[PDB]
Amino acid sequence: AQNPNCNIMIFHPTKEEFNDFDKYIAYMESQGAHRAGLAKIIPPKEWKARETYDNISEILIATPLQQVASGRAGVFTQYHKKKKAMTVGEYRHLANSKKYQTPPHQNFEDLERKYWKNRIYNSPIYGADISGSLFDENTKQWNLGHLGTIQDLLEKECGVVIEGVNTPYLYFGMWKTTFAWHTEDMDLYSINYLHLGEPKTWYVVPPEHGQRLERLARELFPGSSRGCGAFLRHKVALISPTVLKENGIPFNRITQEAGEFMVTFPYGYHAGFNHGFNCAEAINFATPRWIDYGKMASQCSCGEARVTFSMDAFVRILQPERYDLWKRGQD
Ligand SMILES: O=C(O)CNC(=O)C(=O)O
Ligand SMILES: [Mg+2]
Ligand code: NI
Numbered sequence: 001a002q003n004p005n006c007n008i009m010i011f012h013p014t015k016e017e018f019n020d021f022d023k024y025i026a027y028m029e030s031q032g033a034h035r036a037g038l039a040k041i042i043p044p045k046e047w048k049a050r051e052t053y054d055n056i057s058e059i060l061i062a063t064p065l066q067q068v069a070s071g072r073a074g075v076f077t078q079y080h081k082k083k084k085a086m087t088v089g090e091y092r093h094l095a096n097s098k099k100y101q102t103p104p105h106q107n108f109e110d111l112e113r114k115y116w117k118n119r120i121y122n123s124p125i126y127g128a129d130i131s132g133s134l135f136d137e138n139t140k141q142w143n144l145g146h147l148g149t150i151q152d153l154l155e156k157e158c159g160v161v162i163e164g165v166n167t168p169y170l171y172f173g174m175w176k177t178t179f180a181w182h183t184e185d186m187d188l189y190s191i192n193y194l195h196l197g198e199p200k201t202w203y204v205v206p207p208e209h210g211q212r213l214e215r216l217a218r219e220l221f222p223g224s225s226r227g228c229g230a231f232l233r234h235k236v237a238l239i240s241p242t243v244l245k246e247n248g249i250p251f252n253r254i255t256q257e258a259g260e261f262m263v264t265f266p267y268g269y270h271a272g273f274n275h276g277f278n279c280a281e282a283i284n285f286a287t288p289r290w291i292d293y294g295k296m297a298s299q300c301s302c303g304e305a306r307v308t309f310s311m312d313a314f315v316r317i318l319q320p321e322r323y324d325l326w327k328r329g330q331d
């Protein structure tokens, strides 16, 4: 068995190997990359996502989200308070302000310490979940707006044609902006490209150990767990590496820098934070190996998770027994 300790693997594809996306994902899996839940892909030196980032300031962040924490430093939830619209240039200026900017630090480990010590005492503003792309249309390799769609994969594997679309999303971050512990919708893969700016630190639980994280989460967030049998689908709970280690939960960590891709694998729980002003692009995708994860994915039916249009068909076809209850939670 390849990668039996479930370490995060880092890949350096050549420009030739960068042509065929599906083939390279399958290659990484042949080397055991999925066992970690997360892999890093450093593009060949010949590649670029676009020519420059000099002309992005007029992108609108219609609903910036202020991420307000509750709990203790290592075990907290966050809620998202909607703020007034602002442009990316306005948001960049805000991120760099004295109130929001990254503090002085020695290295990534010192900043990580500061994040976990101090996160809860601040409410950073995240420009998350903005439909759009920053890849140039002429970038032919690993262009996250040009991937094979999940609807097409389901149709190719299972024979059933379904409605729905699959487009990317932009994330504008600042120091302390946080992504809570989650797996993807329908335990899909994700791919995330950090276009510019400061790093993003990731934590990940191997897919084979995901239920250990779920059991801890039920213990640590006991009201939430009574409310919903899949409350991590709400994407609000944070648990620090120190607390994970104290509770024996297997995990790994890695820092993504500008110009690097990360792939999350089916049922790989992940969480993390941004170091400072940045912009990432991410999308979900599927492969043949996903189908069995999709069929077994938990679902939130309490009403909280509310998701895209395109998840309806995935539930309907892969999980027909669950469909009626899940759709009620959508309505
Ligand atoms: O970058 C973020 O805020 C969150 N991203 C992801 O969870 C991902 O790419 O799967
Ligand atoms: Mg612009
Ligand atoms: Ni994710």
Ligand SMILES: [Zn+2]
Binding pocket: 227, 228, 229, 230, 231, 233, 234, 300, 301, 302, 303, 304, 305
């Ligand atoms: Zn729920």
